[PDB]
Amino acid sequence: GLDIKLNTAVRQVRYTASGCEVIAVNTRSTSQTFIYKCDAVLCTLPLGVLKQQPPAVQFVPPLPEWKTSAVQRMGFGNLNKVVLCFDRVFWDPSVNLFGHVGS
Amino acid sequence: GLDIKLNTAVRQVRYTASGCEVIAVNTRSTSQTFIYKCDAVLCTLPLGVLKQ
RNA sequence: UUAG
RNA sequence: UUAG
Numbered sequence: 001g002l003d004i005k006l007n008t009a010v011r012q013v014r015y016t017a018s019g020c021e022v023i024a025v026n027t028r029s030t031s032q033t034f035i036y037k038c039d040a041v042l043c044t045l046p047l048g049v050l051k052q053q054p055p056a057v058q059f060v061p062p063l064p065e066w067k068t069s070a071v072q073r074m075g076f077g078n079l080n081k082v083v084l085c086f087d088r089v090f091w092d093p094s095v096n097l098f099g100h101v102g103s
Numbered sequence: 104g105l106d107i108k109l110n111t112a113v114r115q116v117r118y119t120a121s122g123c124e125v126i127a128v129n130t131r132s133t134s135q136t137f138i139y140k141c142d143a144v145l146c147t148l149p150l151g152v153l154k155q
Numbered sequence: 156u157u158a159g
Numbered sequence: 160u161u162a163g
Contacts (some may be wrong), residue, residue, distance in 0.1 A: 138160070
C-alpha cells in the first residue's frame with residue numbers, strides 16, 4: 001500500500017527554511033536524474049553510509065558538527081554468513097547449531 | 104574575466120514560471136552533484152548532444 | 156514534478 | 160547555494 005521508488009539512489013539532500021528537495025538517480029542508468037520536493041525528509045540511511053568518506057550522500061547545507069561528530073564516534077560493525085546448499089542432509093537434524101574452535 | 108565551471112557536466116535543465124535550476128555533476132566523480140539556480144538558462148549544447 |  |  002506504500003509508494004516505493006526502487007532502484008533510486010539518493011545522492012543529495014537539500015533542506016531549507018521553505019522545504020526540501022532530494023536529488024536521486026536511477027541505479028540502472030546513473031545519468032537519469034530525479035528531484036523529489038517535499039516538506040520534510042526522514043533519513044533512514046545506515047550509519048555505515050553516513051560514515052562514508054568521501055560522502056555517498058551529500059547534505060546541503062552540511063550537517064552540524066554535533067551530528068557529524070556523533071557519526072564518527074559511533075561504531076559500525078560487520079559480520080557475514082555463508083549459505084551452503086546440499087542435496088542430502090549429512091548432519092544431526094536435531095542439532096540447531098554447532099561450533100568450530102579456531103586454531 | 105568570466106566565471107567558468109570546468110569539468111561540470113549538465114545532466115538536467117529545469118525551467119519554470121518562477122525560475123530555473125540546472126543539475127550538473129563533476130566529470131571526475133559523477134556522484135558529486137551541483138544545483139545552479141538562476142533566472143534564465145542559455146543552452147549552447149551542440150545539435151549532436153540535443154539529438155542524443 | 157514546472158511539488159501542491 | 161539554504162540562489163539573491
